Symmetry: C2
Subunit: 408 residues, 2 copies
Amino acid sequence: ALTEAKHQQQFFQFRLSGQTIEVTSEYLFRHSDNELLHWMVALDGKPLASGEVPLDVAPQGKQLIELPELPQPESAGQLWLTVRVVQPNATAWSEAGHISAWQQWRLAENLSVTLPAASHAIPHLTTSEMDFCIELGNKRWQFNRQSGFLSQMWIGDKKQLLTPLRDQFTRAPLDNDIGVSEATRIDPNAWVERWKAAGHYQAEAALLQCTADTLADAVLITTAHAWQHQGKTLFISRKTYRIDGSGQMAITVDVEVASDTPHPARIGLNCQLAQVAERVNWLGLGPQENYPDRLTAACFDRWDLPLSDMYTPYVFPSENGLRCGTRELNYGPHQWRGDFQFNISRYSQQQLMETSHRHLLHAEEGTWLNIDGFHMGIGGDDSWSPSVSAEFQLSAGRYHYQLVWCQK
Amino acid sequence: AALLQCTADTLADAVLITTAHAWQHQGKTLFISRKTYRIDGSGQMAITVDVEVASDTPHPARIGLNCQLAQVAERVNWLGLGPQENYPDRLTAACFDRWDLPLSDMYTPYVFPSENGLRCGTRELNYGPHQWRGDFQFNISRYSQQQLMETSHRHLLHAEEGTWLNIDGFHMGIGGDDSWSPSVSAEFQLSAGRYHYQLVWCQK
């Protein structure tokens, strides 16, 4: 959280107007003499321009900066402008080259019109009575017909799932989700308290429908679950899986949330990756952990970091290391695409929920992946009463998300 | 528009139509509308829509479908907000109920024609033998969005051949803080980039 702070607290404010940039100094007594403003442009992570420019802004002053005529590529993707204020020389409290601030804007968007190149190959579907199997080349996908889940997937001979791919609406309760609710003295207004008390944590799925159809070019998996607790339907999960000639899977999801139930901490899926890699690369906001009511200090970019770094050692273990507005992320041979939020560590949430201390958790067989279509804000105004803004609560009822799962 | 794709597939008990269109002005793709019509043996089609909106285009006034039917029925009946014309940034005085009105009450006689009579939060619409179902905003008159727009006075409007129908998954705000500058507040602007909505059309 130290970052959302530094950033919000910065001394230089920015306004971009066209290719022009307005800088505002919040300094009251000092002129900017140890400032340099770098700036850069870049299609989905790829640089196309850099530029340094020395700030000469007085305290309370404004300063103008005209961006040299930008570049423009046809290439799909989003254009992003990012800036930073740099302290060329070292001071007493800062190293030389210290970043004192930054801001970033999205310049443009060239959408992708192009359609794919009509599968050379095709998915084959095996209709066991227990499963629906799908194959195409070295790749195979197992949909269990009784759980409605996607129990297992192979790349060649190797399995990839230790667990299945399933809907998730919960979260190992952060400090603020708990507040002062105790075991003796329960706080019925605690987010967790209300969640706890509604069966969020113990809802149980219910196959309502599981089908396969073969499409002129792909395999269609339809499924629908209802999660309930005491004859009470809390949620409804409606998906479709689409495996096509490129051995690419398209996940489309659509959840219904019963008005009269506390709002979910989240909405998405999770599974245990059989695998374990060293690095994590994604295209979104980062590098650091970031939540919805807490991501203004984060930058959209191509980030590359170590597994160790995607987990936040909060002495009192709780949900963490989330990264928002992710468009893509690669882990091992996997690659996921769409818009979402994710978290990837070596710990089930349960392990998180059930551990009082960080030093008591242990890494698990594979890799726990949490993909969120959506996720509730964290809160924080106080950690003794709900301090989560309504905007950051998943109150829609109706929710939709889609994924593309594939390999390399 | 631009047809990127259009495919009929056959299923166990349904039919699957599948489209992609791209809206462009001068080689900028404004929008993209992806869809699947899925007709079934009950004689009922389920439309799904998934639009993409470019981040650098002024946000759409709205996002939906429309068409002009032939039927021209006396009433209208829906389960949603009303009975009166409600827009998103103005819908508090409305109530969720089962409303049944004359078509006429479906048009609002503003003197300087403009979009009107919208009803938000509709769960079920009904006109003639058709019924539509889901989560939408809608409006229905005998005037085209375009007729309204090229007519300076309500008095010069003329009824069109049948009922025009506007079914919106999404509609921008109305504003009002003032009329000489932009009044729509952000939460009312359609600026998310991705929109998804569903419908179900059927008859009786």
